[PDB]
Amino acid sequence: AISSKPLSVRQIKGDFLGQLITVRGIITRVSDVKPAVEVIAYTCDQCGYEVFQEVNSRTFTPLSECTSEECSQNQTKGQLFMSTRASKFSAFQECKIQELSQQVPVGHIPRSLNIHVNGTLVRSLSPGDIVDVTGIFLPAPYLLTETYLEAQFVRQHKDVEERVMELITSGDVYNRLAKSIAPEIY
């Protein structure tokens, strides 16, 4: 049931790391979309047998020598070149969520967190949105770890041309609509 409960940001303590929590707050900032490599594809110049590296961290080191049996058995130390055509990219975006101004205890600074969102779920958020977000609360390499929330699901807090006839048919609509402008004002 814990994933159902909307936590304020300052309730997200270290013991939650690894859990599919749900957080509540205001988005104070949103990144522009950028691509990130899921799998790098390298061509091999001297044999044409491509090879692949999967990336699973904020950084990586690129391959140099052709590890494929096509080169390795021929002991042919061919050179590898990255191809953006064949590499699988995924859409990446970061958003900073802050607790609601009402939730801040008296005298504390409002606490905030990085949300990372990937794939088709990108650009579901915008600054000034007040929102509930489900995600995996995770560490990142900085013993103190950096931390972020991998977003998974989002809940934002927030025919006619026939229907206009309902007011037109009732008549004197200019006078009435003008009288409908701020009726509490004398």
Binding site: Q46, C47, C71, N74, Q75, T76
Partner: protein, 98 residues
């Protein structure tokens, strides 16, 4: 009784590999089919029509070396190896045997 210590291996164009199916039998299978020479083309293009097949075959056989260096290796093993001599003389012996 003893745990291993590593030593770097090395590979070079052995006459056995040169006599594998993708070796000279590949040349016999494919050279007369793929090289074509004609008065309809200039000398540079005709030379290229030879060189392209031998280069592709050389790379597919032994991709490590450059084509000229491969050719020097081939000329020198041709100068030396007895089984390769028996194969080459067997080719011209087969042509005699026709």
């Amino acid at each position: 009784a003893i745990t291993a210590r590593k030593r770097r291996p090395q590979v070079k164009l052995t006459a056995e590999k040169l006599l594998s199916d993708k070796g000279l039998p590949y040349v016999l299978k494919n050279a007369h089919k793929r090289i074509r020479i004609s008065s309809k083309k200039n000398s540079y293009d005709n030379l290229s029509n030879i060189i392209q097949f031998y280069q592709l075959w050389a790379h597919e056989l032994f991709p490590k070396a450059k084509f000229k260096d491969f050719m020097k290796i081939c000329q020198t093993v041709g100068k030396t190896d007895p089984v390769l001599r028996e194969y080459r003389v067997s080719l011209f012996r087969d042509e005699m045997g026709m």
